[PDB]
């Protein structure tokens, strides 16, 4: 996808 | 697409598709095999 690294995952996904 | 247990593939309306895992607690743009 070439996208910036995914948002830091703690418990639930948040974007 | 093989779906592994603990992973959720979630596509947000911006066109953001992140593969997240509750098992190890990690997310990646890549498709996980195991």
PDB file of C-alpha atoms in Angstrom:
ATOM      1  CA  UNK A   1       0.000   0.000   0.000  1.00  0.00           C
ATOM      2  CA  UNK A   2       3.093   2.234   0.447  1.00  0.00           C
ATOM      3  CA  UNK A   3       1.214   3.909   3.309  1.00  0.00           C
ATOM      4  CA  UNK A   4       2.906   5.295   6.422  1.00  0.00           C
ATOM      5  CA  UNK A   5       3.302   2.590   9.139  1.00  0.00           C
ATOM      6  CA  UNK A   6      -0.044   1.660  10.793  1.00  0.00           C
ATOM      7  CA  UNK A   7      -1.204   3.498  13.941  1.00  0.00           C
ATOM      8  CA  UNK A   8       0.293   2.027  17.163  1.00  0.00           C
ATOM      9  CA  UNK A   9      -1.886  -0.894  18.157  1.00  0.00           C
ATOM     10  CA  UNK A  10      -2.705  -1.184  21.844  1.00  0.00           C
ATOM     11  CA  UNK A  11      -6.016  -3.017  22.304  1.00  0.00           C
ATOM     12  CA  UNK A  12      -8.411  -1.823  19.599  1.00  0.00           C
ATOM     13  CA  UNK A  13      -7.589  -0.350  16.149  1.00  0.00           C
ATOM     14  CA  UNK A  14      -7.753   3.426  15.790  1.00  0.00           C
ATOM     15  CA  UNK A  15      -7.018   5.333  12.571  1.00  0.00           C
TER      16      UNK A  15
ATOM     17  CA  UNK B   1      -7.449 -14.213   1.598  1.00  0.00           C
ATOM     18  CA  UNK B   2      -6.622 -16.455   4.531  1.00  0.00           C
ATOM     19  CA  UNK B   3      -8.007 -15.055   7.769  1.00  0.00           C
ATOM     20  CA  UNK B   4      -5.979 -15.995  10.883  1.00  0.00           C
ATOM     21  CA  UNK B   5      -7.493 -16.132  14.364  1.00  0.00           C
ATOM     22  CA  UNK B   6      -7.114 -12.937  16.350  1.00  0.00           C
ATOM     23  CA  UNK B   7      -6.720 -10.763  13.273  1.00  0.00           C
ATOM     24  CA  UNK B   8      -9.252  -8.204  12.081  1.00  0.00           C
ATOM     25  CA  UNK B   9      -9.068  -6.621   8.635  1.00  0.00           C
ATOM     26  CA  UNK B  10     -10.676  -3.282   8.823  1.00  0.00           C
ATOM     27  CA  UNK B  11     -11.154  -0.860   5.969  1.00  0.00           C
ATOM     28  CA  UNK B  12     -11.885   2.747   6.893  1.00  0.00           C
ATOM     29  CA  UNK B  13     -13.765   5.016   4.458  1.00  0.00           C
ATOM     30  CA  UNK B  14     -10.608   7.091   3.840  1.00  0.00           C
ATOM     31  CA  UNK B  15      -9.342   4.007   2.084  1.00  0.00           C
ATOM     32  CA  UNK B  16      -7.239   2.891   5.008  1.00  0.00           C
ATOM     33  CA  UNK B  17      -7.061  -0.891   5.248  1.00  0.00           C
ATOM     34  CA  UNK B  18      -5.075  -2.060   8.261  1.00  0.00           C
ATOM     35  CA  UNK B  19      -4.561  -5.670   9.296  1.00  0.00           C
ATOM     36  CA  UNK B  20      -4.567  -5.725  13.077  1.00  0.00           C
ATOM     37  CA  UNK B  21      -3.904  -8.588  15.465  1.00  0.00           C
ATOM     38  CA  UNK B  22      -5.168  -8.964  19.035  1.00  0.00           C
ATOM     39  CA  UNK B  23      -2.895 -11.993  19.528  1.00  0.00           C
ATOM     40  CA  UNK B  24       0.566 -10.405  19.435  1.00  0.00           C
ATOM     41  CA  UNK B  25      -0.888  -6.885  19.258  1.00  0.00           C
ATOM     42  CA  UNK B  26       0.562  -5.823  15.933  1.00  0.00           C
ATOM     43  CA  UNK B  27      -0.697  -4.300  12.672  1.00  0.00           C
ATOM     44  CA  UNK B  28       0.702  -4.416   9.132  1.00  0.00           C
ATOM     45  CA  UNK B  29      -0.242  -3.430   5.566  1.00  0.00           C
ATOM     46  CA  UNK B  30       0.940  -6.884   4.482  1.00  0.00           C
ATOM     47  CA  UNK B  31      -1.270  -9.965   4.245  1.00  0.00           C
ATOM     48  CA  UNK B  32      -0.335 -12.399   7.055  1.00  0.00           C
ATOM     49  CA  UNK B  33      -0.127 -16.095   6.183  1.00  0.00           C
ATOM     50  CA  UNK B  34       0.085 -17.590   9.651  1.00  0.00           C
TER      51      UNK B  34
END
